[PDB]
Amino acid sequence: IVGGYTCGANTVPYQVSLNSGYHFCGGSLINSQWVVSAAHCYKSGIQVRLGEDNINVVEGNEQFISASKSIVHPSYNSNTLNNDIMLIKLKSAASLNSRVASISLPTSCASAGTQCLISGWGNTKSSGTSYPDVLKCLKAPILSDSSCKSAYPGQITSNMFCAGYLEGGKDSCQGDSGGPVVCSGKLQGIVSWGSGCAQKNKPGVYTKVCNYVSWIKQTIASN
Numbered sequence: 001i002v003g004g005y006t007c008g009a010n011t012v013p014y015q016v017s018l019n020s021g022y023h024f025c026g027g028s029l030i031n032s033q034w035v036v037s038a039a040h041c042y043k044s045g046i047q048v049r050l051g052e053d054n055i056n057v058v059e060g061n062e063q064f065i066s067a068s069k070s071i072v073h074p075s076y077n078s079n080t081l082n083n084d085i086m087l088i089k090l091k092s093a094a095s096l097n098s099r100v101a102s103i104s105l106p107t108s109c110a111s112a113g114t115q116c117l118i119s120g121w122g123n124t125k126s127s128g129t130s131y132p133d134v135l136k137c138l139k140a141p142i143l144s145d146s147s148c149k150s151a152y153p154g155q156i157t158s159n160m161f162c163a164g165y166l167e168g169g170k171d172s173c174q175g176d177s178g179g180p181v182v183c184s185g186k187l188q189g190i191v192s193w194g195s196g197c198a199q200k201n202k203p204g205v206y207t208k209v210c211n212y213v214s215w216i217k218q219t220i221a222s223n
């Protein structure tokens, strides 16, 4: 997260870290058995880390649970990042508490201008590299589809939306992928891609979760 702030320990209790020897992506807990992330975060051997604040220090509220299965969206296109969503099942159910909590799925899509909370452990610099140990947060509005498509001509599908600031300076970034965009208490986005980070006229691009609710519900009910 570039241009954000330190969230505070466990203030984003649905935020998970995906670990394969190291943190590599975020995700969102949607019930005690299932996490939503980005398809481009897929790999085998994922451990889900819940209740994290400092990802380099055991602080006492963590749960570390191996994935038993991953399901990449059937229409995921790795070239274009269309349908950049996957589901991860936990080998054992998480123990839900105030610091490890699920986030509700949308009952409809969110409007342009709605303010959202974006979070993760990704790079905090727009030029150069600095990774935080603690979770970072950014408040950012959903942008109009025209401003999104103008920024990324030929690259935006109806399964993507933009959020952030056209002036630059505030954005998600590498290492935040797969993590949440929460608006009005619902998981409306997944950190997906962008051009650099926090660059002018290049806002972040997010998977449009509201298009996937039926797929999510049916997939988790059958797996």
Ligand SMILES: NC(=[NH2+])c1ccsc1
Pocket (backbone or CB within 6 Å): 171, 172, 173, 174, 175, 176, 177, 191, 192, 193, 194, 195, 196, 197, 198, 203, 204, 205
């Ligand atoms: N600029 C962004 N929002 C971004 C997200 C993942 S990699 C870059």
Ligand SMILES: [Ca+2]
Pocket (backbone or CB within 6 Å): 052, 053, 054, 055, 056, 057, 058, 059, 062
């Ligand atoms: Ca920790």
